[model samples]
Target: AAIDKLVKASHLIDMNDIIREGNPTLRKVAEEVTFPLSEKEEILGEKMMQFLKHSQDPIMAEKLGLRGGVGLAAPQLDISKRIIAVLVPNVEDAQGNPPKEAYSLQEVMYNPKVVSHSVQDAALSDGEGCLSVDREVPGYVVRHARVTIEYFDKTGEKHRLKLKGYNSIVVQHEIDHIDGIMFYDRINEKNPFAVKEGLLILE
Candidate 1:
């Protein structure tokens, strides 16, 4: 089974493990994982995070033909569970000096949801992409500029976090996956690039 293969240390999650756009599973709301996660659940979280790390590594990514990604949801892997992993790296300066921190946010979030969000909207200037989406979907994927989210970690401890900027964007993208919503669903259908007033477009 895919889960069995993913749990193996020798396995590196490649594109084959990811379900793409036409798959019906991507349209279904994933089931919320219960507390006292099974062993497979725990390892699945770790494996997802590891894939993000490997994807970011220059050499590993090229060797494995990986398209870089900051976040991934379990449904994208055909696992109908509300599990997602986010790994956003801190930007560095031109001098290559260390930024304020190593990572903006890195964790395996389970059953995450946005509890609150701001009225202000934001979008990545270049637009958003998904491993499940193969085509180049050009346009702004509008989302809340700021959001307070709640989720549980692998240990089953609940966490509440307030996020903004890119961190907010990344988390929202992943959460949408578990809910069976695609990023493009929020895009302006008439004019994909149309930015309404008060929208905060980010680089």
Candidate 2:
């Protein structure tokens, strides 16, 4: 039997709620942020990290009925802001028979933008899921195998990095929310999980 997952407390502005996909705000364009982010944004960022930390803790998560995941965006929480939080556990720890948290993060980024991306596309074998869209939309979302993104750190410091594999997949997913794009929309509506030519499949 499949386990039921509970929404993490910190991930919500209100406990147990995620703005669903059909919500008009979920499709609204999030405004780009400027330096010296506001207090509200800072708090949201903190909550996101807390949720990530708790969600990744296997024992804590299972006890709390949390849905484990690697990424989140502001829009999913009903905040139309240019922010994202990612915590992809290190492959070393997560690769064990039962996943373990190595406790890592690309952390929270303000006004993140994809500066460049690889022409080589990839897809997760099992497909993608979203908090904003509860129902299994049932299809693999294509993503760039590699990408270079630029974002401002909390103190208004600018940083850019090249990411690959799971990190790349995660960033692509979250960034779409800021642009009012949903992962299911990336899946061909007419053709679920259909292979695209010239793309690598990541299982």
Candidate 3:
């Protein structure tokens, strides 16, 4: 089974020590952030790569009960700065089984912006969890179903991409962190139950 293969290939790491929520540094927008493969940026990129590679490993995914994750930001992992790592989820393989293929895995964005969003798109309230804020399981937060974003790729080349569905939601969530906005900030106070249970997981 693919899970068995992943188990054999997996190496356990202490996720708790990886940096979690409320770290003052995460609330700050990273500066002097340059891309196109600078030595320092490359090293930072490698760290993101390692996190993505390991986090999606079947063993780790199952252990973490991750539905299927794509796009993790440096701030989410508590490193701060404008760096982001994205992994497009595999749909077919994810049905009743862990996804085996990696999609567009090495792209990193320096600074990003949301150029547009579909007015007809559905409003979704989904639970959100952050690697940096491991303090809670994930809370329901509203987001647009689709968005058009402009960002610089690993080569520092600019591109405008339209993302819909899960991809759009993920990008928007991460970018919000770049602006120092948290999912908690967007929730309606009437629905205070959203974040009632904090600290969703340990390691």
**For all the candidates, what are their Cα RMSDs to the real structure?**
1.0, 5.9, 8.8
Between candidates 1 and 3, which one is better according to TM-score? 1
Tens digit of per-residue lDDT, candidate 1, span 49-96 = 988998998988999889678999999999989999999999789998
Candidate 3, 77: how far from true, in Å?
4.1
- Per-model TM-score, in order, reads 0.97, 0.84, 0.70
Question: Over 4 Å off in model 3, which ranges?
Answer: 1-17, 35-37, 59-68, 93-106, 120-126, 135-139, 192-203
- Model 2: runs farther than 4 Å from truth? 1-15, 92-105
Better of 1 and 2 by lDDT: 1
| TM-score of candidate 2 against the unseen true structure | 0.84
**Ten residues in a row with the worst lDDT in model 2?**
1-10
**Tens digit per residue, CA lDDT, model 2, 95-202:** 455346564355899999899989999888889998766685788798899999999877899999898888888989999999998888778788887888977777
Give the higher-lDDT candidate: 1 or 3.
Answer: 1
Query: In model 1, which runs have C-alpha deviations exceeding 4 angstroms?
Result: none
TM-score of 1: 0.97
In model 1, what are the clashing residue pairs, if there are any?
A: none
* Number of clashes recorded per candidate: 0, 0, 8
